[PDB]
Amino acid sequence: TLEWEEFLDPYIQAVGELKIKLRGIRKQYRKQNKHSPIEFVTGRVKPIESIKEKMAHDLQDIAGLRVMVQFVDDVKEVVDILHKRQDMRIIQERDYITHRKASGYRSYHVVVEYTVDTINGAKTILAEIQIRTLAMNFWATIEHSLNYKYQDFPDEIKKRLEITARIAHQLDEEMGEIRDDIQEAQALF
């Protein structure tokens, strides 16, 4: 409706601004000839339907951003950059990378207050920035679509999704190790 359109305006504006802003971190690393910790960024406003069920703001993810990085070690590099930012205040961090969810989902969550300027004045909202690897984004994107297309998965499907997440993670670890073993195979001998 129009009432929901009005309530979500500031979250829609914030996702827009934060996408541009987080994408510009990457451009800043490349322009100064350095590895960008950030590969790409996406975001959306929670669809009306998903919001409605989940309430008894402290609904943290109405505005959601997804920051993809190549390696697990890049995650902390991005969290530090977010700490140095003057346009947001970090309210909450959750390390679901070191400690995964039961489904297999892995991600680092940073919840921020973000203020948006409107013609009706400043509006401060919460936004959730999810940092994850390419491998975790591969898994989460597919898991998310299969879910949205289903409804709750049979147990056997849920297990198979868990297994593919487990292997996607071993892949991140191994790619982390290849990167290390390259630079080590130059740095120490």
The residue ranges that bind a copy of itself (CB under 8 A) are 5-6, 9, 13, 16-17, 20-21, 24-25, 28-29, 31-32, 81, 84-87, 115, 117-119, 121-122
Within 13 Å, how many C-alpha atoms sit on residue 99's CB side? Answer: 4
81 contact, one of a copy of itself, Cl ion, none, CB 5-8 Å limit per kind = a copy of itself
Residue bearing tokens 């390390």: 95
Contacts with Cl ion by CB under 5 A: the residue count is 2
State the first-to-last Cα distance of the chain, in angstroms, to the nearest integer. 65
- Tell me how far the alpha carbon of residue 94 is from its chain's centroid: 11
Nearer to Cl ion, 67 or 88 (CB): 67
Q: Specify whether the CB–CB gap between 113 and 86 falls below 8 A.
A: no
Q: How far is the CB of 29 from a copy of itself (least distance, A)?
A: 6
Burial bucket for residue 107 (CB in 10 Å: 0-12, 13-18, 19+): buried
Residue bearing tokens 């409107």: 118
Catalytic residue among 128, 143, 156, 173: 128
Contact mark string toward Cl ion, 32..71, x via CB under 5 A: --------xx------------------------------
User: Which residues are the active-site residues?
Assistant: 128
